[PDB]
Amino acid sequence: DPPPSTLLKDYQNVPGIEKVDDVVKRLLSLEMANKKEMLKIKQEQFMKKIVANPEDTRSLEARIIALSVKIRSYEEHLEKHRKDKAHKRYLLMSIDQRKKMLKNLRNTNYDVFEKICWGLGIEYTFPP
């Protein structure tokens, strides 16, 4: 998880944000936000770590990274809510969609697929 003191994605590029009061920094940090902002920060970090062009959001790579972040969130949610069948279905469907996207990326761009698998820790396995 990113540090709770990390600023929100919408405020990192704001000029003068490093000179503001400590309470102001806390209010704009991830600590005083909900989990969606943490997911967005994780997605941006993964994009900067892996993809060549972080600006492109409709690329297959960005979609795979976002779906991986969503899968991570679903797994975290189901760690506590074991009986949540709806989110169990969401997690399984997201995993299947990510498998399909990984198959397409591996068929299209293999070096990028290897970078995705290494960065996100995905171990691609062929279906039975």
């Binding site: 405020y11 704001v14 003068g16 944000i17 009061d21 309470v23 102001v24 209010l27």
Partner: peptide
């Protein structure tokens, strides 16, 4: 927004 927040924090408890 952030400047208005800076102004408002002065009034915080």
């Amino acid at each position: 927004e952030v400047l208005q927040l800076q102004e408002e924090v002065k009034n915080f408890i």
